[PDB]
């Protein structure tokens with residue numbers, strides 16, 4: 001139950017109750033062009049910069065009001081890499097894809113402008129104690 | 137010759153440190169250093 | 185009377201220490217003490 | 233992988249001593265020697281004795297002090313003379329007009345303003361002034377003009393003010409007048425000392441500042457200080473200053489007579505703007521009037537230059553008064 005570390009990165013999953021970032025505007029609905037064993041390719045995402053979707057997840061409706069979610073290893077051009085393979089993904093079903101946050105403060109503010117809620121500690125201190133040996 | 141106009145017997149060191157006490161806290165009561173009570177009181181809102 | 189011809193403000197201490205870093209080593213790159221880089225380089229053979 | 237590692241490590245302090253950019257050399261006046269040298273040794277000091285002092289500003293907050301290195305002439309090896317602390321200093325935001333008494337001046341880019349104390353001796357350009365009041369937040373201080381062995385002078389905006397009192401590096405060796413020195417200031421930090429090769433060089437010419445007598449003090453003309461308007465009869469009043477009696481006390485021009493010095497007199501030069509016409513020496517009174525005899529010979533002098541100085545045994549004061557005044561009255565300026 002620690003769930004706390006004094007590191008540079010955000011230490012928060014994009015969209016959690018701590019980031020307070022609304023992903024609904026960033027939702028993208030698309031029909032995949034081609035599905036392979038490990039790669040799902042679509043031309044619509046080809047218009048975004050490389051790594052835009054890295055860290056995001058893909059959710060689609062299985063039955064009723066329940067959706068199955070899959071994380072994305074990497075995004076490059078028109079090809080998306082799916083962790084654990086693409087098995088179970090419908091070839092023509094409607095898919096919802098959300099972006100992913102790298103966690104860096106520059107990434108957090110330039111893309112999402114959520115710097116005030118940034119949970120990371122970029123440049124407060126790395127080691128400096130007040131009971132060391134020589135300050136200089 | 138004679139006693140200097142002034143003598144540098146020691147230096148005063150100033151440092152500006154930023155630190156965190158953990159997760160959200162309600163009230164800070166006192167600060168103790170080297171067994172001497174430096175400050176005692178109570179603050180419940182962001183301030184100086 | 186007057187300022188002494190010289191004043192002993194401090195002493196310089198010299199020590200000769202022999203130590204081992206463990207088993208066979210290939211290269212020693214740098215020595216750091218008190219957070220200050222005393223020496224940086226590279227030696228691969230017995231020498232000064 | 234997708235994630236990347238950011239820089240944060242330890243961010244080592246950047247001590248890396250730099251050379252001093254702001255500094256100055258000065259000659260110690262009699263005021264400090266009076267209060268730092270015992271009378272027995274002081275009385276034996278000849279009139280030609282001179283002492284050297286230096287002032288500097290900290291280039292970085294990580295430097296504690298600097299080392300003083302100097303040599304005689306342009307040749308020889310530098311001999312360490314000691315270390316000194318940083319001298320608080322600031323920049324004048326507005327010009328300082330020629331006026332005796334306290335004057336309010338605002339300082340910009342002030343350094344170590346907190347440590348300044350009232351009553352200290354401050355030197356700017358070639359004038360020594362005394363601080364009367366201090367404002368820490370706004371950096372506004374009141375300065376007494378024309379103190380010790382100095383006289384008021386025009387100081388343009390940007391002049392540097394040094395509060396050398398208790399913040400100067402002094403070389404105890406005694407040097408005779410007329411010798412030229414070359415000295416350098418080396419910064420000192422916990423990481424070590426600055427290499428001399430990177431230290432700036434400077435030269436100064438000694439002038440026996442302590443030897444020369446103080447100039448006259450209260451300089452009031454017809455009851456006005458530095459007036460451009462006088463109605464006819466010319467009356468000039470001056471004060472007599474004795475360096476020995478004053479000792480370490482700072483006395484400005486507004487104070488009255490403090491008695492003369494043994495063998496010290498007052499000399500006045502009268503010019504016609506560019507040419508020298510009359511010269512009165514050996515003056516011992518506190519006032520002088522232009523004799524009626526020379527008024528017709530020289531005729532009306534609408535533009536009159538007044539030069540005042542003190543001389544003893546042919547030793548003229550380092551500084552002097554000089555102003556060109558305009559006369560008005562009957563027979564003067566009836567073109568209007």
Ligand SMILES: [Fe+3]
Pocket residue numbers: 010012014019101103108114
């Ligand atoms: Fe974030």
